[PDB]
Curated annotation (Swiss-Prot), chain C:
GO terms for molecular function: RNA polymerase II complex binding; RNA polymerase II complex recruiting activity; RNA polymerase II general transcription initiation factor activity; TBP-class protein binding; zinc ion binding. General factor that plays a major role in the activation of eukaryotic genes transcribed by RNA polymerase II. Belongs to the TFIIB family. Keywords: Metal-binding, Nucleus, Repeat, Transcription, Transcription regulation, Zinc, Zinc-finger. The chain holds residues 14 to 176 of 345 of the full protein. It comes from Saccharomyces cerevisiae (strain ATCC 204508 / S288c) (Baker's yeast). A zinc finger (TFIIB-type) spans 7-40. This is Transcription initiation factor IIB.
UniProtKB/Swiss-Prot annotation, chain E:
Belongs to the RNA polymerase beta' chain family. Residues 301-318 are annotated as: Rudder loop. The chain holds residues 2 to 336 of 1733 of the full protein. Mutagenesis experiments demonstrate that the minimum viable CTD contains eight consensus Y-S-P-T-S-P-[A-S-N-G] heptapeptide repeats. Identical and simultaneous substitutions in a number of consecutive repeats are lethal: 'Ser-2' -> 'Ala-2' (14 repeats), 'Ser-5' -> 'Ala-5' (15 repeats), '2-Ser-Pro-Thr-Ser-5'-> '2-Ala-Pro-Thr-Ala-5' (10 repeats), 'Ser-2'-> 'Glu-2' (15 repeats), 'Ser-5' -> 'Glu-5' (12 repeats), '2-Ser-Pro-3' -> '2-Pro-Ser-3' (15 repeats) and 'Tyr-1' -> 'Phe-1' (12 repeats). The binding of ribonucleoside triphosphate to the RNA polymerase II transcribing complex probably involves a two-step mechanism. The initial binding seems to occur at the entry (E) site and involves a magnesium ion temporarily coordinated by three conserved aspartate residues of the two largest RNA Pol II subunits. The ribonucleoside triphosphate is transferred by a rotation to the nucleotide addition (A) site for pairing with the template DNA. The catalytic A site involves three conserved aspartate residues of the RNA Pol II largest subunit which permanently coordinate a second magnesium ion. The gene is RPO21. It is found in: Nucleus. This is DNA-directed RNA polymerase II subunit RPB1. Zn(2+) 1 binds at C66, C69, C76, H79. Disulfide bonds: none annotated.
From Swiss-Prot, chain H:
The lineage of its organism: Eukaryota, Fungi, Dikarya, Ascomycota, Saccharomycotina. The keyword Cytoplasm applies. InterPro entries: NA-bd_OB-fold, RNA_pol_Rpb7-like_N_sf, Rpb7-like, Rpb7-like_N, S1_domain. This is DNA-directed RNA polymerase II subunit RPB7. Present with 6420 molecules/cell in log phase SD medium. The gene is RPB7. GO terms for cellular component: cytoplasm; nucleus; P-body; RNA polymerase II, core complex; RPB4-RPB7 complex.
Curated annotation (Swiss-Prot), chain I:
It is found in: Nucleus. It comes from the Eukaryota. This is DNA-directed RNA polymerase II subunit RPB2. Belongs to the RNA polymerase beta chain family. Zn(2+) binds at C6, C9. The lineage of its organism: Eukaryota, Fungi, Dikarya, Ascomycota, Saccharomycotina. DNA-dependent RNA polymerase catalyzes the transcription of DNA into RNA using the four ribonucleoside triphosphates as substrates. Second largest component of RNA polymerases II which synthesizes mRNA precursors and many functional non-coding RNAs. Proposed to contribute to the polymerase catalytic activity and forms the polymerase active center together with the largest subunit. Pol II is the central component of the basal RNA polymerase II transcription machinery. It comes from Saccharomyces cerevisiae (strain ATCC 204508 / S288c) (Baker's yeast). The binding of ribonucleoside triphosphate to the RNA polymerase II transcribing complex probably involves a two-step mechanism. The initial binding seems to occur at the entry (E) site and involves a magnesium ion coordinated by three conserved aspartate residues of the two largest RNA Pol II subunits. Component of the RNA polymerase II (Pol II) complex consisting of 12 subunits.
Length: 167, 131, 144, 185, 331, 56, 86, 171, 48
């Protein structure tokens, strides 16, 4: 490491896919191994968070419709989380009310679908998080997609995503 | 209206990097700086005297031809050909029918270009894209 | 017509307003007299110069003089350059008037308070439209 | 002299006029360092071009800035707060923006209606400054040679019959001394 | 009571990197610009805005808050101001270094007088440690009185290899007071020409020196450049550095640093007004010399051969160097 | 070095040369008000969880 | 972690130094005074320093000394395994 | 956006927890000091992944404090906003200055200047709401907001979004 | 308000707090006035 002073840094902006310095595409994990930036859509984040919560509950104990899921999530959260969990409660409620894929089968299908285009993790997460009906809507809501994927492929991918929607 | 943006009057001499873009909605010349400043937040009315047609930043493109009339005609031709697209084999080699079809397509393009029957022509395009 | 920038010491526990405050200078503390809670600690009690903001107002200036080693050329040139200042010229008239007042009072064997009051009166009454055509001798004598 | 002072000083700062000091030895009087004023066309043209570009750029940047949202101001401490900086100071009731130093409601900033005024100013300025642009185009088309005291003396029209100043350039022999900005290509 | 809790991580100082402020860094760091040589307004009730004791620079009173951080006297560390000098001035503590660098580099193009084409200069440049490398380079270069546009090639002395130069004869630089005076030696046909090397000229020459050129001399491209040894923006220390003492609290006393800063501001304003209109070169030179002397005494009031700044009481003015040195100093 | 003599000259030279000080010295740690690496400070005291678990 | 010398090749003295003993006793006394769990039976004691001395005598101080070397490397020595003979 | 990030923290343990079960106290402190917290560098730290395998490094006793500083490496799910990114949320508060949409653990404030001209503020209706010919925006409404600006503090994040662009606003 | 800012560097999440003598702070400020930049860093840049 050499000397360091004021340097010009590219302002963070999703349009240019410049996520900053701590959210680069190429990350290093705690074991020193190289990895790609893990970006999760709303449904994937919901499932991962709930998996971690159930694992935590199992550890401590050892040693459907939107309303029912919301009630179960709230009670499990309060039981298996400590104080100052207002943000986590709001996050769980928002994820449950804004998710489009409920089960691991649907989420895995979405992943195996959207990993074909080879877009940025942020872009694929945006496509899996925002419900778009037309390629123009997707283009306007995700400016970075411009000049990266053709309207034909985008239309087919969006159609399949809408096809495999829950309920 | 020779080498400067009519809105901001940015001369190429003082801005050698200035690049002018065009919008198919009204085909009015405008510089990238004006486009960014006026349409970054969202759609807005065209910044021209006598033009009140809204346009989006994403629709801007680079002018190919130096003649605005020919650019308009060619763009409308592209839009038409994206719908009326047939080959000689489509009529089993019937040159008379193919020629009549080409004449009809040219007449439609002319009508769109000169605004003869905009409503009827657009409805016909919409129907034929379905069929 | 400006930011408050005021600090008021009050005891959070007592809540009494105004509070009874004791300044323990020896212990360097400010303590609530009722409950004993300390409100502020590490209170503070030649490197500078003193001035009277009644006869000179706000005017900070420094002289130039010889040192343990110095060349007369630099002192002379620097004093010459310092003399040719436009902003300081205006107050130099008041300073010269003060000097003449001091000389007159000292030759009159008057107490220090007399000459201080004379200088204050001269400063207060100077730079006004009414006293523009009168001799400086008359002005100084009236002030004295 | 006092009136001439500001004019010469401003023109020298803008580099529309160059200065040249030299020692002159009259045959029957004490020598005196006389000051001559002339125009160095390349430097003057460069200064004019840069200033015109800077003025136009300043107006364009002002237009771009004005196109941005207004902001907020504090009447008491007279502090400006951007929209982003003000969004983090709102009260718990989510009703009004409160200042940090004063804890007082903020007031919306001005410049909302000047959007057209700045564009009008730019439109006026370009039309008024049109001649300079054309002259600069012709100058760029041509090539100009830098002027010097001696070169300018070749076109001299004597001001007075018996002017005390000796309008001659007699450089010292074998003088290797070089002064800043005293040489030309 | 103690100081208020902070959310920033608590760490221990492990390294100290010294350097010189750039004018851009001074302007960026500064929270306010000081343009009035006064301390209080006409009412003597609150500090004048833009004056020496601007409230934005901090507070030295137990009753007032800082207009910048809104913290008390026991928590505000002090915030720096700045004064934009009318003309660049030398740093009193770097005059000798500036003179050595001037003798080492050309005064018309900023290129080292001796390149890697000389064996002695190669040996000098081969020294690892910056201080002794600079000493050797200065010893070799100070005797070169010409830029040597063309130099013999290292393969053989038959042909000459061209190097970037100007062919201008270098001057002999001498230190007269707080000024640098250069003497150019004439040709056969006779006394040498003499003139004062303006601070602006030296600043331009130093700014024309290349990164490698001054890295060889020992200056750091990132933390210390030769151009930064000349002051264009003077930082103004906050009131905590120069507190206003009180004897009976009915009479107000100001620090010697405050007095000197007021003198600097007055001299700068005088020079600006002069050079703005008229002000023949003689008057401009006198004003520039006054400003340089005031800055030099503000940073160090004990300069050999120069007059000392004296207050009305007649005692020498206490400078920052005086505060730092001695058995009773900061260290 | 400035703590002994020629304080201001040494500091100016350090600033000009962009010197880096590693704060390995007692004088540096004294100026910065941190525990110098001398005597009781020449080592770091860390907690032993392996022994904590076995101390009951 | 190339700066951590493995336990099999430690070359420092196996005897606790006076400075190490002083710092260990002071740190343990501070922890005890701040209501830390004591792992040694007390036959009646109120001085944290005396309690720490008892803990050191019985080798019940859960602290490890990280001895530093001039090159930046270090060796970890447990108080239990460090001989107290001074 | 939601990301899985590998983070490191410095936890301080009081001497009162230097018992045979200090690791459990460290894990509890992590769950009480990280979960639900906001950092400018990594966003809102929502959940800690792999709660059974947090990497706890050797602790260092502070010189004078007497506490133990442990370097704890863990993997957590963090929500980091970015300007130019489109999100969906629910309006929680409305006022003349604009409405505040709740997106996960964050709140995006929509200024009036960043709203379409047709939308206007109306305090007559209870609760106060914005009414336009095509749609009405009020509390509990679903709004698609494009983040226009973000200001990140060491322990705070605030964002401003817009709904003027096409295909934004009420969902 | 739990806010930090270093104007000039345009950063708000890279601040550290250190405990030093007020005399040391005064010395550093005096050097800053004298145009010397004592920069305190909490991490090492060169190996022993
Ligand atoms: Zn334009
Ligand atoms: Zn138009
Ligand atoms: Zn009380
Ligand atoms: Zn305010
Ligand atoms: Zn402050
Ligand atoms: Zn040269």
């Amino acid at each position: 490491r050499r000397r360091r002073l004021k340097k010009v840094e590219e302002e963070e902006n999703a349009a240019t896919l410049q996520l900053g310095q701590e959210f680069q595409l190429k990350q290093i994990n705690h074991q020193g191994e190289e990895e790609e930036l893990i970006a999760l859509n709303l449904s994937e984040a919901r499932l991962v968070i709930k998996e971690a919560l159930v694992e935590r509950r199992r550890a401590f104990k050892r040693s459907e419709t939107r309303e029912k899921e919301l009630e179960s999530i709230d009670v499990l959260l309060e039981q298996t989380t400590g104080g100052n969990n207002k943000d986590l409660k709001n996050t769980m409620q928002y994820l449950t009310n804004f998710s489009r894929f409920r089960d691991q089968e649907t989420v895995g299908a979405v992943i195996q679908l959207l990993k074909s285009t080879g877009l940025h993790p942020f872009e694929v997460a945006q496509l899996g998080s925002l419900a778009c009906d037309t390629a123009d809507e997707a283009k306007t809501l995700i400016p970075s997609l411009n000049n990266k994927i053709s309207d034909d492929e985008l239309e087919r991918i969006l159609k399949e995503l809408s096809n495999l929607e829950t309920l | 209206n020779k080498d400067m943006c009519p809105i901001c009057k940015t001369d190429r001499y003082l801005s050698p990097d200035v690049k002018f873009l065009v919008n198919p909605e009204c085909y009015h010349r405008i510089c990238e700086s004006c486009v960014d400043r006026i349409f970054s937040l969202g759609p807005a009315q065209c910044p021209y005297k006598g033009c009140d047609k809204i346009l989006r930043k994403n629709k801007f493109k680079t002018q190919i031809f130096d003649d605005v009339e020919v650019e308009k005609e060619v763009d409308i031709r592209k839009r038409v050909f994206n719908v009326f697209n047939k080959t000689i084999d489509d009529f089993n080699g019937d040159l008379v029918e193919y020629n009549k079809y080409l004449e009809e397509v040219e007449d439609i393009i002319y009508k769109l270009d000169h605004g003869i029957d905009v409503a009827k022509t657009e409805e016909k395009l919409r129907t034929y894209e379905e069929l | 017509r400006g930011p408050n920038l005021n600090i008021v010491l009050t005891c959070p526990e007592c809540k009494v307003y105004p509070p009874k405050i004791v300044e323990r200078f020896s212990e360097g503390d400010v303590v609530c007299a009722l409950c004993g809670l300390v409100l502020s600690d590490k209170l503070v009690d030649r490197v500078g110069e003193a001035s009277n903001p009644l006869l000179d107002g706000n005017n900070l200036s420094t002289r130039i003089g010889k040192g343990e080693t110095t060349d007369m050329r630099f002192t002379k040139e620097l004093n010459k350059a310092q003399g040719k200042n436009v902003m300081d010229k205006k107050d130099n008239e008041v300073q010269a008037a003060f000097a003449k007042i001091t000389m007159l009072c000292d030759a009159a064997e008057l107490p220090k308070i007399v000459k201080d009051c004379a200088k204050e009166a001269y400063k207060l009454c100077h730079d006004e439209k009414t006293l523009k055509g009168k001799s400086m001798e008359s002005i100084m004598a009236a002030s004295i | 002299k006092t009136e001439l002072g500001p004019l010469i000083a401003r023109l020298r700062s803008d580099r529309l006029i160059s200065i040249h000091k030299q020692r002159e030895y009259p045959p029957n009087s004490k020598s005196v360092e006389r000051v001559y004023y002339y125009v160095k066309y390349p430097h003057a043209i460069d200064a004019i071009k840069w200033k015109v570009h800077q003025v136009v750029q300043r107006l364009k940047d002002d237009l771009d800035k004005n196109s941005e949202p207004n902001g907020y101001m504090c009447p008491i401490c007279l502090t400006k707060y951007t929209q982003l900086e003000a969004v983090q100071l709102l009260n718990f009731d989510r009703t009004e923006f409160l200042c940090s130093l004063c804890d007082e409601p903020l007031v919306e900033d001005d410049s909302g209606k000047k959007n057209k005024e700045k564009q009008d100013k730019l439109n006026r300025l370009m039309d008024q400054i049109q001649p300079i642009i054309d002259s600069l185009k012709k100058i760029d088309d041509s090539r100009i040679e830098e002027n010097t005291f001696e070169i300018a003396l070749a076109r001299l029209i004597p001001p007075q019959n018996q002017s005390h100043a000796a309008y001659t350039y007699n450089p010292k022999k074998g003088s290797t001394m070089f002064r800043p900005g005293d040489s030309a290509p | 009571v103690g100081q208020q809790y902070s959310s920033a991580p608590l760490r221990t100082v492990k390294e100290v990197q010294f350097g010189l402020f750039s004018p851009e860094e001074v302007r960026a760091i500064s929270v306010a610009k000081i343009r009035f040589p006064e301390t209080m307004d006409e009412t003597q009730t609150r500090a004048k805005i833009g004056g020496l004791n601007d409230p934005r620079l901090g507070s030295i009173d137990r009753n007032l808050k800082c207009q910048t951080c809104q913290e008390g006297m026991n928590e505000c560390p002090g915030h720096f101001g700045h004064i934009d000098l009318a003309k660049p001035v030398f740093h009193v503590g770097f005059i000798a270094k500036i003179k050595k660098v001037c003798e080492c580099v050309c005064m018309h193009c900023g290129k080292l007088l001796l390149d890697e084409h000389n064996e002695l200069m190669r040996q000098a440049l081969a020294i690892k440690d910056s201080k002794k490398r600079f000493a050797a380079i200065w010893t070799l270069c100070k005797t070169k009185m010409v830029c040597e546009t063309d130099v013999p090639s290292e393969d053989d002395p038959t042909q000459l290899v061209s190097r970037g130069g100007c062919g201008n004869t270098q001057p002999t630089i001498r230190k007269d007071g707080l000024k640098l005076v250069g003497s150019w030696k004439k040709d056969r046909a006779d006394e040498p020409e003499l003139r004062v090397l303006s601070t602006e000229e030296i600043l331009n020459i130093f700014k024309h020196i290349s990164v490698k050129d001054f890295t060889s001399l020992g200056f750091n491209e990132v933390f210390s450049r030769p151009e930064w040894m000349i002051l264009t923006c003077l930082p103004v220390p906050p009131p905590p550095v120069r507190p206003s003492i009180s004897f009976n609290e009915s009479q107000r006393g100001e620090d010697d640093l405050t007095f000197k800063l007021a003198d600097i501001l007055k001299a700068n304003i005088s020079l600006e007004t002069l050079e703005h209109n008229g002000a023949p070169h003689h008057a401009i030179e006198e004003a520039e010399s006054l400003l340089q002397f005031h800055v030099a005494t503000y940073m160090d009031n004990d300069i050999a051969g120069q007059p000392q700044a004296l207050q009305k009481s007649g005692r020498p003015v206490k400078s920052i160097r005086a505060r730092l040195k001695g058995k009773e100093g900061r260290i | 070095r400035c703590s002994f003599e020629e304080t201001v000259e040494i500091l100016f030279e350090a600033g000009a040369s962009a010197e880096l000080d590693d704060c390995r010295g007692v004088s540096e740690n004294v100026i910065l008000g941190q525990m110098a690496p001398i005597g009781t400070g020449a080592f770091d005291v860390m907690i032993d969880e392996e022994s904590l678990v076995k101390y009951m | 972690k190339e700066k951590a010398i493995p336990k099999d090749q430690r070359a420092t003295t196996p005897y606790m130094t006076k400075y190490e003993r002083a710092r260990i006793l002071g740190t343990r006394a501070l922890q005890i005074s701040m209501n830390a769990p004591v792992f040694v039976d007390l036959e009646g004691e109120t001085d944290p320093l005396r309690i720490a001395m008892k803990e050191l005598a019985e080798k019940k101080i859960p602290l490890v000394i990280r001895r530093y070397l001039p090159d930046g490397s270090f060796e970890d020595w447990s108080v239990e395994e460090l001989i107290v003979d001074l | 956006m939601f990301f899985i990030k590998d983070l490191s923290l410095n936890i301080t343990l009081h001497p009162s927890f230097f018992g045979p079960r200090m690791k459990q106290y460290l894990k509890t402190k992590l769950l009480e000091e990280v979960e639900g917290s906001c950092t400018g560098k990594f966003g809102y730290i929502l959940c800690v992944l792999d709660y059974d395998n947090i990497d706890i490094q050797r602790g260092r006793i502070l010189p004078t404090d007497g506490s133990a500083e442990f370097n704890v490496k863990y993997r957590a799910v963090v929500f980091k906003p970015f300007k130019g990114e489109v999100v969906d949320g629910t309006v929680v508060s409305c006022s003349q200055h604009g409405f505040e949409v709740q997106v996960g653990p964050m709140k995006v404030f929509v200024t009036k200047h960043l709203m379409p001209q047709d939308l206007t503020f109306n305090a007559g209706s209870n609760p106060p709401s914005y009414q336009s010919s095509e749609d009405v925006i009020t509390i509990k409404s679903r709004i698609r907001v494009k983040i226009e600006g973000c200001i990140s503090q060491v322990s705070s994040i605030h964002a401003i979004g817009s709904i003027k662009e096409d295909y934004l606003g009420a969902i | 308000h739990n806010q930090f800012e270093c104007k000039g560097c345009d950063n708000k999440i890279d601040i550290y707090q250190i405990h030093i003598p007020y005399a040391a702070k005064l010395l550093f400020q005096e050097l800053m006035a004298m145009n010397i930049t004592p920069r305190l860093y909490t991490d090492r840049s060169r190996d022993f």
